[PDB]
Amino acid sequence: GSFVEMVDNLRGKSGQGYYVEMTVGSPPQTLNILVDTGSSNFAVGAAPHPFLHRYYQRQLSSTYRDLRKGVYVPYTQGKWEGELGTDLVSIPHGPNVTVRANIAAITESDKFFINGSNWEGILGLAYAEIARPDDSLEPFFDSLVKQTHVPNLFSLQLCGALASVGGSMIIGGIDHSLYTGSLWYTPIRREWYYEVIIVRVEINGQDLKMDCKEYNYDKSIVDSGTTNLRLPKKVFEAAVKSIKAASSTEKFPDGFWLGEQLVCWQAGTTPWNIFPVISLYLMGEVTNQSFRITILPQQYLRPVDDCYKFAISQSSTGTVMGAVIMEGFYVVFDRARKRIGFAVSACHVHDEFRTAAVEGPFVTLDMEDCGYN
Numbered sequence: 001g002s003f004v005e006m007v008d009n010l011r012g013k014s015g016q017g018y019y020v021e022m023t024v025g026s027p028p029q030t031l032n033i034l035v036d037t038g039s040s041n042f043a044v045g046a047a048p049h050p051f052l053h054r055y056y057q058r059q060l061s062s063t064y065r066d067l068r069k070g071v072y073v074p075y076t077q078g079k080w081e082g083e084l085g086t087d088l089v090s091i092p093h094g095p096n097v098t099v100r101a102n103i104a105a106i107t108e109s110d111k112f113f114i115n116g117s118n119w120e121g122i123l124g125l126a127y128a129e130i131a132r133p134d135d136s137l138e139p140f141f142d143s144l145v146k147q148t149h150v151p152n153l154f155s156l157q158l159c160g161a162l163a164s165v166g167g168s169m170i171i172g173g174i175d176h177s178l179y180t181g182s183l184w185y186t187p188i189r190r191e192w193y194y195e196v197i198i199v200r201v202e203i204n205g206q207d208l209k210m211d212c213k214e215y216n217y218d219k220s221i222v223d224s225g226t227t228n229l230r231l232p233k234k235v236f237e238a239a240v241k242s243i244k245a246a247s248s249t250e251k252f253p254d255g256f257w258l259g260e261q262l263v264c265w266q267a268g269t270t271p272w273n274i275f276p277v278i279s280l281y282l283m284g285e286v287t288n289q290s291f292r293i294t295i296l297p298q299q300y301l302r303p304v305d306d307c308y309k310f311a312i313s314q315s316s317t318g319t320v321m322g323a324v325i326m327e328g329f330y331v332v333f334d335r336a337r338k339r340i341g342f343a344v345s346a347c348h349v350h351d352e353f354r355t356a357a358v359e360g361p362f363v364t365l366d367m368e369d370c371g372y373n
């Protein structure tokens with residue numbers, strides 16, 4: 001209902017992620033930790049990397065326990081590796097609890113830490129199935145729910161704005177002040193990533209008319225650790241062709257659509273009106289029932305004279321609903337009921353003509369056929 005102490009507990013810089021303050025060990029060691037719904041490991045810098053403001057010093061903790069196991073995490077854009085162990089963890093601007101959690105002490109990395117950022121670790125909030133080295137390594141939120149009376153739910157309000165960013169991570173609840181209108185739920189298809197099903201796509205109310213399996217090839221996920229709205233290659237081509245057609249009053253280079261170049265207008269003269277709204281229809285809670293979420297160019301044209309980057313991009317890992325999607329909405333990760341809720345965010349960026357929207361119910365048949373196998 002109301003969680004005043006957790007409101008505004010997220011900070012960051014544009015394109016550098018959202019972080020929360022955490023404490024590790026005894027006596028407590030304060031660290032800034034990136035909130036990531038796209039991964040499942042709690043991993044912190046444990047060595048004096050030059051980009052880091054601070055790091056986990058295991059030698060100073062009386063509650064530190066060594067698991068005597070390594071962890072190696074290569075991924076597409078980089079890699080991190082470390083040493084597994086446990087320790088006492090708390091969230092100063094969160095629930096009044098202390099938990100014994102798995103912690104990967106980062107001992108080597110490449111393109112993981114950001115030069116100029118104010119975070120030193122990552123909080124993977126997804127499920128055990130995608131945890132490294134395997135699903136036997138219990139993620140943080142699972143340890144939290146198991147050892148305390150904290151309800152199995154968390155919500156995110158990412159507000160956006162190198163300009164400073166803010167938001168709220170409500171642990172174990174929902175804060176009704178952070179959204180307007182009603183919450184609409186989409187089922188979590190499978191507990192690994194926060195996997196969802198997109199059943200329809202519209203550009204200014206105009207349907208893309210693609211086989212809905214294309215929207216979810218090979219999956220659709222909700223990821224706070226990603227900036228862009230990432231679309232499968234075939235869907236991106238069709239969406240761009242439709243966005244270019246809708247905004248044809250002004251012509252832009254082909255490189256802009258691919259994120260290779262920026263577009264500039266004289267300060268305070270950005271023509272938001274010429275850019276279309278983008279709607280994603282999501283699988284509802286009832287058979288043949290869907291709802292839709294709508295974003296504005298204020299969410300997908302990102303500030304870098306006012307210059308902008310097109311923050312919709314092509315993907316080979318499926319649909320990624322990153323910060324572009326999440327900044328328009330209050331997102332409820334209702335783990336207890338295996339569903340994700342969306343509502344219009346009380347902090348989303350809009351104008352006097354259009355606002356972000358969450359609407360329903362809509363009749364959509366064969367929604368289960370939209371999922372990739």
Ligand SMILES: NC1=N[C@@]2(c3ccc(F)cc3F)CO[C@@H](CF)C[C@H]2CS1
Nearest residue numbers: 017034036038039073075112223225226
């Ligand atoms: N959702 C993602 N999280 C990862 C990530 C996110 C932000 C960041 F600053 C650094 C990262 F490494 C961590 O988990 C990797 C998977 F293990 C994937 C990457 C990229 S996308």
